[PDB]
């Protein structure tokens, strides 16, 4: 009750009670960590969310980043479970925190989940990513974030300041920076954050592993069915410029 | 002020987001499965060099890593572009469908290079058995894209100061909606690691909830201590660390832990060691 | 100058020609011999591989086979760290060197491909595996796969072809145990040598040689090794290029097996010459 | 007993009764089928043996064609069982016939053995190649011949009337011609000849399948652990000159 009101560095939050068969869990869903990457900020690195007045409504997942929605087998569970379950919006840089209900009196290790999706799709809100059972079972704090996908996350004209590539990865790093500064308000221990992610989420984990500015934001890493060195997970500079120029041609841009 | 690159992006920013999505798949260099248009770029900024180069030359003492794959990585992708494949039949492909499936699964690769794939992956006693060829293509795609990349990374972290644990996830969810021939497809361990079977509404079996409670414990433990095992339970089946020599991993399924050696060692020598040499000398 | 040359060789005593004979080999090697049939356009119209698939073979009966361990004999004549007097437990370093001498006159990349297929990447350092592996390289490259190529091409152009693998180690054999059934040690049995009372063969080997002598002369008589009408024993099926059937010549009865080291000869007969002619 | 005097087109022969546990066969060993290939005839194709007066002692094996003698393991059985067991000579173009003791009353099929040893060694008089048991147990006619090995049978300077090459194969062919003309004198059927051989002998049989002038001289073929198409049984005309001219240089010629 008073366990559902929490103040992080940029303002107050109101979370929700999630029930499980083992007992309840405190959840804070849809916390802004970046200013909306919109208009002139499309394709640019994310900027930290500035502070806000009042209490943010953190009781349900915020929007899904704009992505292609798969239509091979319409209405079929094996494909729909990976499709967006919120509205699409470029305004999507929000993260979620699950924490054991009796907020741990001692600092708990924290797991941070990076969803996969080929770098073109995915959302932290999918039912298959619900952190409530992992928290209630192992009494650990769990965080997940959205990050721009497709052209919005990874279109690149290498060398230019206006579309520099990899901003989806930079969304992820910003959320890791948010955990470092704020997870301690939910009972988490910033000195024990474990990254984990599946498929392109796993390749993402690999890259924070190999990027010195990310490597102070986590202590250990879990890679499920993916690696940064796979044939699909990176592209050359010349090839990225070649695909960005073709997208602009197909869309009418001289 | 205009230059020309700034011109390009300024225009792209005027388009509605939907307009950009509806042309995304159209920029791929050729027909392919398990390829995506806008992925991380090796630009020298975020990634100071290619991920491969960084791995080979990096020092990883003080790091614990937990990695793994599912039994049938490739099967899911085949239904999105390989000839003859569908969720809705047995996908018993012909040999000519198989050879064509190899050019789609391994795109951007020379004729000689795809001969070498057909060499490794066909059963020259039964070159045309359709079931055998379905599994072969499933292995070509899943090996080339997931397993041998993972196994290459894992051997190198381990050999260069990391402390690595590896699994093969090989339980097929009792609730799985994909057809049987796909086995345990890409992404279908996630349910269990997030303990979804614990959800009363999803109709999982009783033994399956135990399995998820088990798996959450391995994952929590690793988070907690960089070691999935239980410290005070020595007599429980130990998960040994993957090393480049002994290449030990465990099988995660309903049976107690079992140790195996070699993450498709024979295949991954082709993909990680010989194929690169072949593309260079031709 | 050409006739001027041979005249001088005809004045040299025969033993000096024999002395320098192995020196004219191009690149150090094993299973390679200086003076062999030349493709001259007289006796051999074209390379044997050409003659083999545009030939006159319909109506011809052919009997072809290999021993179980074709390669071992030759490793003691060039391969590093081999001998009949130890276990030949070679290092990876020695294994690699032996590939370049087992498969000489082949590009650096081609030799990488051999190492790729015959190494066991769980146990790349294990000496016993490396030993038998290098045995198989030399055995497949020189004997098994050329035989397997010949059989199926004749079969495909209408030869009646029968194929065996001989896998019985003579109890008399003086070569060490790790050589298995070496090159040339089916001969004694085909010729009925076990029947000689001077020799020390088993009673049970005596019946074996009589069964082999029966197969070979059944073939010479009739083009079919099989005991005519006899249904007490398994039939020896002819080799076709599809089913690829052969028998094991063993102290046990005929086992009919399919596929004559198929995955290996795919490399040796099809992929390797592509690699060679593209680098 | 009287079946040990037999007459071929060249003249008269005297043979030996040989012993077997099953009972005797009668053999003719060391029959001259070529004029001795020596002096000016070294490297030249074989000429057919001029006819002879008197009776030829065909009772022991004749000389072994000049060859390298294995010294790797001295006295070792497995090594020595392949080494020559008669004096070396270039005068070596002799063949042998085994035939069942009561000579077959009807024409019986003929097995022709071609020995191996990588075209640099071998002889028809080795103990392993003994025909008495095959001829007694199976009542076929067995023939084996000697052929020139090493430089003596295969040095080639392609294009010269002086070392045309393959003369060791021409030796074998001359022997097969001999059995076409004479195996009837021993109970053999010239229309039912089966070649068999091992190692280089298997390679030789294979080459006779592929050389039209040999196809009229046999009807079936067994190839044991060898084939003409392998990587070691043939060389190109350019390699043959290379190897021929090097021997000549290694030996003081020009
Ligand atoms: C398994 O199914 C696949 C996929 O086909 C899809 O699912 C099946 C259950 C059927 O209901 C299909 O109608 C459905 O699309 C089979 O492969 C598919 O075969 C069809 C032919 O029936 C192909 O369509 C053709 O396309 C060409 C142009 O390429 C047209 O000219 C034709 O007139 C026709 O429309 C289709 O392209 C093909 N799909 C793929 C991905 O290759 C597959 O044959 C089947 N397997 C077995 C063993 O039957
Ligand atoms: C048996 C009989 O009644 N008379 C033979 C007579 O047939 C035979 O002549 C040879 O017959 C054979 C048939 O198998 C070939 O047609 C011979 O031609 C060749 C060959 O290919 O064998 C031609 C070839 O160019 C020659 N090679 C050279 C010159 O380098 C060889 C060569 O001369 C060899 O001596 C053949 O072994 O011959 C054809 O000459 C002769 C033997 O040659 O003997 C009679 O008794
Ligand atoms: C197996 O034996 C070979 C052959 O060497 C000979 O036979 C041995 C029984 C022993 O008596 C050696 O001294 C003989 O020379 C070994 O190959 C040689 O080994 C020696 C020293 O071991 C070395 O100096 C030579 O260079 C080797 N020859 C080469 C490399 O061509 C081989 O090492 C033995 N293997 C094992 C595992 O003992
Ligand atoms: O105009 C519509 C266009 O649609 C194109 O579609 C191309 C093929 C269909 C899309 C597609 C999907 N997939 C895998 C699907 C998700 C599986 C996945 C992928 C990566 C991951 O990391 C994870 C991890 N967790 O989920 N999962 N691959 N391709 C056509 O070309 C054409 O119809 C047309 O151009
Ligand atoms: O893992 C991720 C990485 O985070 C680095 O840390 C930087 C953290 C920055 C902020 C920060 C917070 N804190 C207090 C920690 C709690 C102390 C604690 C622990 C256990 C307890 O029981 C109690 C009991 N009662 O209070 N308290 N310190 N700094 C790492 O250096 C790097 O190794 C790693 O990669
Ligand atoms: Cl306020
Ligand atoms: Cl459906
Ligand atoms: Cl507590
Ligand atoms: Cl689900
Ligand atoms: Cl940064
Ligand atoms: Cl890479
Ligand atoms: Cl630690
Ligand atoms: Cl088949
Ligand atoms: Cl089958
Ligand atoms: Cl350690
Ligand atoms: Cl195992
Ligand atoms: Cl494998
Ligand atoms: Cl002399
Ligand atoms: Cl040898
Ligand atoms: Cl080279
Ligand atoms: Cl080892
Ligand atoms: Cl072992
Ligand atoms: Cl009988
Ligand atoms: Cl079998
Ligand atoms: Cl095989
Ligand atoms: Cl075999
Ligand atoms: Cl192979
Ligand atoms: Cl000895
Ligand atoms: Cl009779
Ligand atoms: Cl040439
Ligand atoms: Cl040349
Ligand atoms: Mg291969
Ligand atoms: Mg089949
Ligand atoms: Mg190695
Ligand atoms: Mg050839
Ligand atoms: Mg040449």
What key phrases describe this protein's structure?
A: 254 residues; alpha/beta; Rossmann fold; three-stranded mixed β-sheet; 12 strands; B: 282 residues; four-stranded mixed β-sheet; 10 helices; 4 strands; 41% helix; binds a molecule of 4 linked components (NAG-NAG-BMA-FUC); binds a molecule of 3 linked components (NAG-GAL-SIA); binds a molecule of 3 linked components (NAG-NAG-FUC); binds the ligand OC[C@H]1O[C@@H](OCCCCc2cn(CCCCc3ccc(O)c(/C=N\O)n3)nn2)[C@H](O)[C@@H](O)[C@@H]1O
CATH architecture of chain B: 3-Layer(aba) Sandwich
The distinct bound ligands, ions and cofactors come out as: a molecule of 4 linked components (NAG-NAG-BMA-FUC), a molecule of 3 linked components (NAG-GAL-SIA), a molecule of 3 linked components (NAG-NAG-FUC), ligand 4J1, chloride ion, magnesium ion
Structural class of chain B: alpha/beta
Taken as a percent bin, the fraction of beta residues of chain B is 5-15%
Termini separation of chain B comes to 45 Å
Alpha carbon gap, first and last residue of chain A? 57 Å
PDB class: hydrolase
Keywords: cholinesterase, glucoconjugated oximes, Hydrolase
Assembly: tetrameric
Entry title: Crystal structure of human acetylcholinesterase in complex with (2R,3R,4S,5S,6R)-2-{4-[1-(4-{5-hydroxy-6-[(E)-(hydroxyimino)methyl]pyridin-2-yl}butyl)-1H-1,2,3-triazol-4-yl]butoxy}-6-(hydroxymethyl)oxane-3,4,5-triol oxime
């Amino acid at each position: 009750d008073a366990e559902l009101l929490v103040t992080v560095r940029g303002g107050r939050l109101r979370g929700i009670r999630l029930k499980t068969p083992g007992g309840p869990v405190s959840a804070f869903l849809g916390i802004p960590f970046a200013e909306p990457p919109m208009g002139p900020r499309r394709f640019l690195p994310p900027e930290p969310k500035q502070p806000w007045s009042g209490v943010v409504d953190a009781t349900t997942f915020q929007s899904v980043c704009y992505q292609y929605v798969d239509t091979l087998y319409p209405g079929f569970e094996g494909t729909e479970m990976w499709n967006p379950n919120r509205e699409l919006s470029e305004d999507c840089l929000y993260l979620n925190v699950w924490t054991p209900y009796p907020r741990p009196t001692s600092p708990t290790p924290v797991l941070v989940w990076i969803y996969g999706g080929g770098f073109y799709s995915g959302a932290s809100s999918l039912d298959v990513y619900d952190g409530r059972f992992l928290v209630q079972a192992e009494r650990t704090v769990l965080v997940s974030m959205n990050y721009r996908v497709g052209a919005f996350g990874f279109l690149a004209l290498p060398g230019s300041r206006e579309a520099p590539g990899n901003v989806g990865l930079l969304d992820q790093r910003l959320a890791l920076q948010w955990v470092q500064e704020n997870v301690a308000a939910f009972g988490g221990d910033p000195t024990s954050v474990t990254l984990f992610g599946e498929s392109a989420g796993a390749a993402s984990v690999g890259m924070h592993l190999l990027s010195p500015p990310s490597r102070g934001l986590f202590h250990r890493a879990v890679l499920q069915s993916g690696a940064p060195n796979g044939p699909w997970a990176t592209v050359g500079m010349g090839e990225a410029r070649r695909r960005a120029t073709q997208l602009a041609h197909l869309v009418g841009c001289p | 002020t205009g230059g020309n690159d700034t011109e390009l992006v300024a225009c792209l920013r005027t388009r509605p987001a939907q307009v950009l999505v509806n042309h995304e798949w159209h920029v791929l260099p050729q027909e392919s499965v398990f390829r995506f248009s806008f992925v991380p770029v090796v630009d020298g900024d975020f990634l100071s060099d290619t991920p491969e180069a960084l791995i080979n030359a990096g020092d990883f003492h003080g790091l614990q890593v937990l990695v793994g794959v599912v039994k049938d990585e490739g099967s899911y992708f085949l239904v999105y572009g390989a000839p003859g494949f569908s969720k809705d039949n047995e996908s018993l492909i012909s040999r000519a469908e198989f050879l064509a499936g190899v050019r789609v699964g391994v795109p951007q690769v020379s004729d000689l290079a795809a001969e070498a794939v057909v060499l490794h992956y066909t059963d020259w006693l039964h070159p045309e058995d359709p079931a055998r060829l379905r599994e072969a293509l499933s292995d070509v795609v899943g090996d080339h894209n997931v397993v041998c990349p993972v196994a290459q990374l894992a051997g190198r972290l381990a050999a260069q100061g990391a402390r690595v644990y590896a699994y093969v996830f090989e339980h097929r969810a009792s609730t799985l909606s994909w057809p049987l021939w796909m086995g345990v497809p890409h992404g279908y361990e996630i349910e269990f690691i997030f303990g979804i079977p614990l959800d009363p509404s999803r109709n999982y079996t009783a033994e399956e909830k135990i399995f998820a409670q088990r798996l959450m414990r391995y994952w929590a433990n690793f988070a907690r201590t960089g070691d999935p095992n239980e410290p005070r339970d020595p007599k429980a089946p130990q998960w040994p660390p993957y090393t480049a020599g002994a290449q030990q991993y465990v099988s995660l399924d309903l049976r107690p832990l079992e140790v195996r050696r070699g993450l498709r060692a024979q295949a991954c020598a082709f993909w990680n060691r010989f194929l690169p040499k072949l593309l260079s000398a031709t």
